[PDB]
């Protein structure tokens, strides 16, 4: 029907072109009979007829005419939907400033005239004057006056002088301005003169000007001359039942505007004095500005009510505007809603659905089939037949259901498994039966939550809901490859009871010919469910190429494992059922069955697991009781010991021996020690308490306690809650966040008295309040993440680039937190990776890595893999499928088309509810030190002069088991490459003492060290070695204030000791508190100290927003020799000396704060100059795009893996891509852009590849990271920038620019109601894009 | 919750000059010149922690 949406300003000729009438009178409807009043706000000749094809008088009532207008009273006899469509206008007598171009924060009349906003409001409220091109006599153009100054200027200059006041003055200012003359002027001011922040504002203003002239706008259209009015059926005045009406408040607003306009015309007829008409023009300004956007004035309230009324921008902007209440989400027919329930007799491609809901939803289908089958002659008979519910319609309804999927939906639809299709089975009842294994996908418990069904009407939607959204398709999460149809609670208890073994049972150690007589023995009662038994089983395997090689053997197993073995499909080995089968084990079982046998055996296998789990859980009789929580006999003894120990610390505090804080810390440590002893008592009193006998004395085993099975199976709860039921419960925290010294020494099996329970109540209520508030903030985080990233669609099959990031394991300080295998599994390689024997190609350059390839990775010794990442792709306006990866509900590579920005942002924001010395080496291997520069001291050790040293514990297989960020100046015992043992502290630094260690060996001296000024004479009481030690800034005198104390070295001859290898001596400058221990002329060795210097979810919403950290890590711009400049300004000049390039960079550092580097050293670009958090801007601007995306993914994966929630890294990487789309160009060159202009990276990239393919020079850019609430509004498509965030600024910024929106990316297409260019509609948009302009 | 105003103006809104405002909110140290040298009257509690 149409293409791209265009937006611009409205000329008064354009507004008279729209309108079909002038609304001259403030009436709405006649009061006695409710015909509309001519010609009021509700008119006939202006807008349309009231009834379908009927004049208002009655001369034309039927379809005899449609073109005529009645000459008694004007009515264009048409449909009344036309009254929903035609618009009106108001001829405003005096002109009026448009509030959107006056009061939004980047004010357009404000910085279009280059005039401050308070002076503009001073002109518009008739408080002052302004000259309007008044020649050149004495007064400038923008020079305002007052009334007395106006009398001054008029008596001093009677003529050739022009200065009005009010809206006429601003309109004359905007009309008088010649734009391109000032364009030349500002280009000259940006060529010669340089006033940095002011010229940045100036180049912003010239950007606005040459964007304005490039549009088709005129400036004086920012002042309203003729104001359009909205159609009547958008501001309706309709009868309620009872003779009383509902008006919209826009009727009040247009009534006030029309009223004051008629008053101002009536006053200018009667030639009113100036005070009265200036009052009336201010009032008309207020009326119009209250109509366009009420709330940017004194909030003009309505009549007979204190509540503020609702204007137009109130109806566009906000939670209740059209963008978010009636366009992005609509209330939908063919839907239903009821309470959900279990019904375990279902296969998971089907759900229950009530007969009454199925009759109410599918009414037109039933109507169609009944008039086809001739049981109803007409359709009214079909209505009465389904109304009376005769017995013939239920067979008809069973025909129309049979293969027609419905959509089930739970209301917090966070991730994309919230809407799934099913096939209905009709239910005698009124509750939707919902399959149990599906419910963990919904986060739906059955405690009264109610779900909604929708019906795909058309045929394509039926095929979509079957092919894409049927429940058997979604058995893998989009967040990771883990199964989401994991068996949840009863079924895992039935399994964990079924596959276990007690040492004596019926049929102990007998022999069985197969699983079938295992079932015949259990169900006859001769042999027990669990007894260790040799059976004969036949397992199949995929040894040959997709071939089922059979091997049979006598496995030593139990009875119940053999009974479960009938349910395992052919492909799996027997070792998947030979263990105890908790929840983790059954998730691994379903994962291996899917990764081997495909989809169909996994679906039917999940159904059979659920059936057998519920059945043998029923046969289990696993029942909780009061004897099932064994209290330790060692409980009250440990509590009495702790009660004596707190009395010991109480006597030690009443003796004045300790202070309060160390008392507090000792008491909390001994109560935590008592709690840990109680936990290790109760666990050993539960889990091994069952001790029974077979052919001998005794033997212990794991317990058949009910609560131990319910905690060990992973069904519900873990040992924290079992601890709070049996042992003492924890140490509660008061509302301070402080934690009470008297813990709750009673569990729930014992009673709690009043004070303990009253203390526990605070933790409970804080928990509930935090769950509510974190729910709200997680919703907001999901919304920002999807609205920054709906534009991204997999569009090309392959780009073919060599880019990529470097996947390494994420080990840090302790053991492995996420290995190499489950990071790289699913991605694709950029270049080929090689064996530790080099030139051995183990994978080629770009193959999709699946599980056998990661097996090939682990059988070799690979540690680091280069991987194609979506943040470094080459594709225009999307991500090519061969670069993205594979992870989806399927296991193959991502298809061409499917939206991954939306699934990525949902898979990030969906777990938002769930969110909150020396080297002690653990493991053994060989030692490696990266970026190390050290020197052997006299004591046989090794002192380190480079602080980029990374310690790696490399075993015999090349991989890294431990890493340690080596501090500067540590004391290594072993060297590098020597085989180290466990526990061996190699480097032992002093963490309280910053080292001033050297590379030299000679006589330490004083240089520029004046006694009493830079250094004081201290005489020690403990050690006794008196010295001259550097003091602070307050006490150092005005001579030695800027003069700094320095240390330097000579040998025995008196000549200056040079560093062995270079020519610079070690002259080092000490800060305050840097203790000079060794004095003038005292020998040291290599690296001795010349002195000593003693002493949750909003994290994620800070990372993706990329807010500036509070104390930033400072980083060197370019690599070079670091040096100091001037002293004592509060800052210091950090000067860099590159060897090859031009040096003269210096940066202000607040010199109170502890630095890291010494002046004698040299830093690399992007190396740290101090510590603390760092901004993402610095990491992107110095190191590289790969480094900043690694920084974001490692930080936010630390935040998620702290809670223990897996999210695949593709999603975070593609949000990082959607962050940094904008990039400011540095060198313009042959391009059209500017030296400070901000344009998106894809637009400058297609410009350069047209120019760089030619012989011309391109345009060099500066990549610029933006936050998610700012990279989503800085968009070349304004409806996606106007649908969620600040609306008024976006519509005015895109209305002054004449910006054109090409619908580009799923937000606009949901808005405008056509197909989506991601999913099934991608083929349609591809056909149209091939058709469009070709 | 209107704009921040200086405090003592409300004291000057209650018919108070600077004399008795400083009398009500402070204690008076008396400097006498006993024939020379501008001496100081002393209460010893005034020297605490100084």
């Amino acid at each position: 029907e149409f293409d791209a949406i265009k937006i611009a300003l409205a000329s008064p000729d354009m507004i008279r072109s729209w309108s079909f009438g002038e609304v001259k009178k403030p009436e709405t409807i006649n009061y006695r009979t409710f015909k509309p009043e001519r010609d009021g706000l509700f008119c006939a000749r202006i807008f349309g007829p009231v009834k379908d094809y009927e004049c208002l008088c009655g001369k034309y009532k039927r379809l005899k005419h449609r073109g005529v207008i009645c000459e008694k009273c004007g009515v264009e006899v048409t449909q009344t939907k036309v009254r929903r469509e035609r618009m009106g206008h108001i001829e405003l007598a005096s002109p009026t400033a448009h509030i959107w171009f006056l009061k939004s924060l980047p004010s357009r009349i404000g910085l279009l005239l280059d005039m401050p906003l308070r002076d503009i409001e001073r002109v518009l409220y008739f408080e002052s004057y302004v000259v309007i091109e008044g020649g050149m006599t004495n007064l400038e153009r923008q020079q305002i006056l007052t009334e007395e100054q106006y009398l001054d200027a008029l008596e001093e200059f009677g003529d050739e002088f022009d200065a009005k006041m009010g809206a006429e003055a601003i309109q004359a200012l905007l009309k008088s301005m010649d734009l391109e003359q000032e364009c030349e002027q500002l280009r000259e001011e940006l060529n010669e003169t340089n006033s940095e922040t002011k010229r940045k504002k100036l180049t912003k203003r010239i950007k606005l000007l040459e964007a304005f002239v490039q549009s088709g706008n005129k400036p004086e259209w920012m002042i309203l001359t003729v104001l359009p009015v909205l159609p009547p059926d958008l501001r309706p005045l309709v009868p309620l039942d009872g003779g009383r009406f509902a008006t919209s408040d826009l009727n009040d607003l247009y009534r006030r505007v029309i009223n004051r306009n008629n008053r101002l015309k009536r006053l200018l007829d009667l030639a009113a004095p100036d005070i009265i008409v200036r009052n009336e023009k201010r009032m008309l300004q207020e009326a119009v500005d209250a109509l366009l956007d009420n709330g940017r004035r004194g909030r003009a309230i309505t009549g007979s009510n204190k509540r503020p009324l609702k204007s137009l921008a109130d109806m566009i902007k906000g939670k209740q505007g059209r963008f978010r209440q009636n366009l992005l989400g609509k209330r939908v027919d063919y839907s239903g809603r009821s309470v959900i329930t279990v019904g375990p007799y279902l296969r998971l491609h089907q759900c229950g659905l009530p007969k009454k809901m199925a009759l109410e939803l599918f009414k037109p289908f039933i109507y169609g089939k009944l008039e086809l089958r001739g049981l109803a002659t007409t359709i009214k008979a079909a209505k009465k037949m389904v109304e009376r519910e005769e017995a013939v319609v239920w067979d008809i309804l069973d025909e129309v259901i049979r293969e027609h999927p419905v959509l089930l939906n739970r209301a917090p639809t966070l991730h994309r498994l919230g809407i799934q299709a099913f096939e209905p089975v009709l239910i005698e009842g009124k509750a939707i039966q919902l399959h149990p294994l599906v419910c963990a996908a919904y986060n739906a418990d059955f405690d009264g939550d109610q779900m909604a069904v929708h019906v795909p009407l058309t045929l394509e939607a039926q095929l979509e809901a079957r092919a894409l959204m049927m429940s058997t398709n979604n058995i893998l999460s989009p967040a990771n490859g883990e199964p989401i149809i994991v068996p949840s609670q009863d079924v895992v208890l039935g399994l964990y009871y079924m596959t276990r073994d007690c040492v004596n049972a019926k049929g102990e150690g007998m022999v069985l010919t197969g699983p079938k007589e295992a079932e015949r023995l259990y169900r006859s009662g001769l042999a027990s469910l669990h007894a260790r038994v040799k059976v004969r089983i036949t397992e199949y395997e995929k040894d040959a190429n997709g071939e089922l090689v059979a091997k049979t053997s006598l496995k030593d197993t139990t009875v119940g494992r053999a009974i479960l073995w009938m349910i395992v499909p052919k492909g799996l080995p027997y070792s998947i059922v030979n263990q105890a089968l908790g929840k983790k084990a059954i998730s691994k079982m379903l994962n291996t069955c899917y990764r081997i046998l495909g989809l169909k055996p996994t679906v039917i296998f999940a159904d059979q697991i659920m059936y057998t789990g519920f059945a043998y859980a029923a046969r289990s009789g696993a029942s909780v009781g009061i004897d099932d929580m064994v209290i330790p006999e060692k409980k009250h003894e440990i509590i009495s010991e702790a009660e004596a120990e707190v009395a010991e610390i109480q006597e030690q505090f009443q003796s004045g021996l300790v202070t309060a804080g160390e008392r507090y810390n000792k008491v909390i440590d001994i109560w935590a020690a008592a709690n840990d002893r109680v936990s290790k008592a109760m666990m050993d009193n539960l889990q091994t308490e069952t001790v029974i006998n077979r052919d001998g004395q005794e033997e212990k085993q794991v317990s058949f306690n009910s609560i131990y099975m319910m905690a060990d199976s992973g069904a519900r709860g873990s040992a924290a809650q079992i601890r709070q039921l049996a042992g003492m419960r924890g140490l509660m925290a008061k509302p301070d966040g402080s934690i009470i010294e008297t813990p709750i020494t009673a569990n729930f099996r014992e009673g709690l008295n009043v004070l303990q329970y009253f203390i526990s109540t605070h933790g409970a209520r804080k928990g509930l309040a935090d769950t509510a508030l974190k729910t709200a903030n997680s919703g907001y985080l999901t919304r920002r993440l999807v609205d920054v990233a709906q534009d991204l669609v997999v569009t090309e099959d392959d780009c073919g680039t060599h880019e990529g990031i470097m996947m390494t394991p994420v080990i840090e300080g302790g053991d492995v937190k996420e290995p190499l295998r489950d990071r790289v599994l699913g991605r694709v390689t950029a270049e080929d990776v090689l064996k530790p024997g080099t030139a051995d190609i183990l994978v080629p350059r770009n193959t999709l890595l699946h599980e056998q390839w990661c097996d090939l990775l682990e059988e070799n010794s690979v540690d680091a893999v280069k991987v194609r990442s979506v943040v470094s792709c080459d594709t225009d306006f999307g991500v090519c499928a061969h670069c993205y990866g594979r992870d989806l509900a399927r296991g193959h590579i991502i298809n061409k088309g499917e939206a991954i920005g939306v699934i990525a942002a949902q898979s990030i924001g969906e777990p938002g509810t769930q969110l909150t010395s020396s080297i002690q080496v653990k493991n053994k291997g060989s030692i490696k030190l990266s970026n190390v520069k050290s020197v052997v001291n006299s004591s046989g050790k090794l002192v380190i002069t480079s602080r980029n040293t990374e310690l790696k514990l490399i075993d015999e297989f090349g991989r890294t088991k431990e890493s340690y960020k080596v501090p500067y100046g540590a004391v290594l015992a072993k060297g590098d490459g020597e085989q180290v043992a466990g526990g061996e502290t190699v480097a032992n630094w002093d963490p309280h003492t910053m080292p001033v260690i050297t590379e030299v060996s000679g006589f330490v001296r004083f240089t520029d060290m004046i006694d009493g000024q830079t250094i004081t004479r201290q005489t020690d009481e403990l050690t006794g070695l008196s010295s001259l030690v550097v003091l602070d800034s307050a006490e150092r005198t005005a001579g030695g204030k800027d003069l700094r104390p320095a240390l330097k070295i000579v040998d025995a001859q008196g000549n200056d000791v040079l560093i062995p290898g270079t020519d610079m001596p070690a002259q080092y400058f000490l800060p305050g508190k840097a203790i000079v221990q060794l004095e003038d002329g005292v020998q040291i060795s290599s690296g001795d100290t010349l002195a000593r210097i003693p002493q949750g979810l909003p994290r994620v919403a800070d990372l993706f927003e990329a807010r500036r950290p509070k104390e930033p890590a400072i980083l060197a711009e370019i690599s070079g020799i670091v040096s100091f400049g001037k002293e004592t300004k509060g800052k210091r000049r950090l000067v860099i000396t590159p060897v090859d390039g031009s040096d003269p960079y210096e940066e202000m550092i607040p010199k109170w704060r502890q630095l890291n580097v010494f002046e004698g050293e040299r830093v690399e670009r992007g190396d740290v100059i101090s510590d603390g958090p760092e901004a993402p801007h610095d990491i992107l601007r110095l190191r590289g795009v790969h480094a900043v995306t690694r920084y974001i993914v490692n930080e936010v994966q630390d935040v998620y893996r702290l809670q223990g929630v897996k999210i695949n890294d593709k999603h975070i990487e593609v949000i990082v891509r959607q962050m940094l789309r904008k990039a400011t160009i540095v060198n313009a060159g042959s391009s059209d852009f500017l030296e400070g202009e901000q344009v998106e990276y894809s637009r400058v990239k297609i410009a350069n590849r047209e120019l760089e393919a030619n012989g011309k020079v391109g345009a060099t850019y500066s990549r610029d990271l933006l936050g998610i609430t700012k990279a989503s509004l800085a968009t070349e498509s304004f409806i996606s920038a106007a649908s969620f965030q600040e609306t008024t600024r976006v519509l005015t910024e895109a209305a002054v620019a004449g910006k054109r929106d090409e619908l580009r990316g799923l937000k606009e297409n949901v808005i405008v109601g056509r197909l989506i260019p991601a999913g099934t509609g991608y083929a349609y948009h591809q056909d149209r894009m091939r058709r469009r302009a070709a | 919750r209107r704009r921040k105003l200086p405090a003592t103006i409300i004291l000057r809104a209650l018919n108070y000059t600077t004399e008795q405002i400083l009398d009500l909110f402070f204690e008076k140290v008396i400097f006498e010149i006993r024939d020379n040298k501008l001496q100081m009257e002393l209460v010893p509690e005034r020297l605490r922690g100084e």
Binding site: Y31, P236, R263 | -
Partner: protein
């Protein structure tokens, strides 16, 4: 702060109050202004003779004593006859003595006895605006001659004005300055016909009113200065008495119209008061002006403060109901039933119900229903103007069935039955119109129509159409 009521107060706070004698002084300035505009009328004979012809329309029984003027300085029809008979003798003895300075005192006496007449502002302002239109045509011809010669031919305005302003009548400026052989006299020779024609039209305007523009310019600049004096005086009095408008409009604030709307309607009423003020009665300005201000404000609140505009007497009835139900509520005690308002008032108690119904202000469609959710009143109002889609299905099936049944008839019967009703065409056609369609007899169409309906009423055609009537 913006708060434009306060900006209005500060804009009017500079104007100070008046003493009790300064009002009389401003009123005397108003008298001087109307004196000078009536004396400006007193020199213009065409307005005189125009009102004389209108008075002959009075004497021809086509007008009334209360149409032309009202009142004399000592309104009777015999008084009108004798005063206008003396006027008649005066203007038959006055005008015909131009045959100049002999007639001038006669014209002044005719002017004085014309000023002895108290006019209606309709005729008065008509004469004023007609003089204004005449002046605008004269200025249009002057600026036309200027835009012909001065700017285009580079003739200086000083040499333009030199023999033009001072004679303006004849060719002494035109024809002599061509003959005086100036360097600009040649450039007239392309424009001499149009300049001369505009000069002759200036002479034409002189011949219409009898005197030259040398007199007419001084007449209407005297009128303009007198009226500007009067308007400055009335501006000064209005600027003074804004305070009275505020002190009155403090009372009616909560009656549904905004505060500044009230004071602006009061300022319109105050300007009407300054128009119709008379100090010679001796009352202060306050006592006279207060009724006009309250009248304008009450009329405005009754006019424009309601969505459905209910008229003046209806609002008087509503305010009587609220006043009497305020009085009776403290007399009886419970609240008055309208049965008590039957005997309390003079209305038949069935009209009191509808007066009670009309006086209800409509609800805002965003008035919140309970618990303050996004649920407002607007999300509950159903649309009753749509048709249900089942009715559309019946209409589709009925068109299909009727098309299949009319296919079963003959050619003429189906064609007549489609032509007669609105079936799948434009407007229906009646008997004589279908007769002019087919060139056939009127009654024959009725016979064919009855035979067609008789064919349709029988079963095997009546079944599928009787199915569309539900019982």
């Amino acid at each position: 702060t913006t708060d434009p009521v306060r900006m209005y107060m500060r804009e009017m706070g500079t104007v100070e109050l008046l003493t009790r004698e300064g009002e009389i002084d401003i009123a005397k300035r108003i008298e001087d202004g109307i004196n000078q505009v009536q004396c400006s009328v007193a020199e213009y004979p065409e307005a005189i003779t125009y009102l004389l012809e209108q008075y002959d329309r009075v004497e021809a029984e086509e007008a009334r004593l209360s149409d032309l003027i009202t009142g004399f300085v000592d309104i009777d029809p015999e008084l009108a006859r004798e005063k206008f008979a003396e006027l008649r003798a005066q203007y038959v003895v006055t005008r015909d003595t131009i045959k100049h300075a002999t007639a001038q005192e006669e014209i002044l006496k005719l002017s004085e006895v014309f000023k002895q007449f108290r006019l209606v502002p309709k005729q008065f302002d008509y004469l004023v605006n007609s003089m204004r239109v005449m002046m605008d045509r004269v200025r249009t011809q002057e600026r036309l001659i200027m835009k012909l010669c001065v700017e285009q031919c580079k003739m200086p305005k000083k040499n333009f004005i030199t023999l033009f302003t001072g004679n303006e009548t004849s060719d002494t400026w035109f024809n002599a300055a061509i003959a005086m052989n100036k360097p600009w006299s040649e450039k007239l020779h392309d424009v001499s016909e149009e300049v001369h024609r505009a000069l002759q039209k200036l002479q034409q305007i002189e011949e219409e009113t009898g005197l030259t523009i040398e007199q007419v310019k001084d007449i209407n600049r005297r009128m303009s200065i007198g009226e500007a004096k009067a308007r400055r005086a009335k501006k000064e009095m209005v600027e003074a008495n804004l305070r009275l408008v505020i002190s009155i409009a403090k009372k009616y604030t909560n009656r549904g119209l905004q505060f500044l709307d009230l004071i602006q309607e009061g300022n319109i009423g105050l300007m009407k008061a300054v128009d119709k003020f008379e100090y010679r009665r001796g009352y202060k300005f306050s006592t006279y002006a207060t009724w006009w201000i309250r009248q304008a404000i009450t009329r405005s609140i009754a006019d424009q403060a309601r969505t459905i505009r209910i008229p003046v007497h209806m609002i008087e009835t509503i305010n009587k109901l609220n006043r009497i139900s305020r009085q009776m509520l403290q007399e009886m005690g419970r609240e008055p039933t309208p049965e008590e308002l039957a005997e309390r008032m003079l209305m038949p108690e069935d009209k009191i119900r509808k007066v009670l119904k009309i006086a209800k202000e409509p609800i805002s469609m965003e008035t919140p229903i309970g618990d303050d959710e996004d649920s407002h009143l607007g999300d509950f109002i159903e649309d009753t103007t749509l048709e249900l889609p089942l009715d559309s299905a019946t209409t589709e099936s009925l068109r299909a069935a009727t098309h299949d049944v009319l296919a079963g008839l003959t050619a003429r019967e189906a064609k007549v039955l489609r032509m007669r009703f609105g079936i799948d065409m434009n407007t229906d056609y009646t008997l004589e119109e279908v007769g002019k369609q087919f060139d056939v007899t009127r009654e024959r169409i009725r016979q064919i129509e009855a035979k067609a309906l008789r064919k349709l009423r029988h079963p095997s055609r009546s079944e599928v159409l009787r199915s569309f009537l539900d019982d």
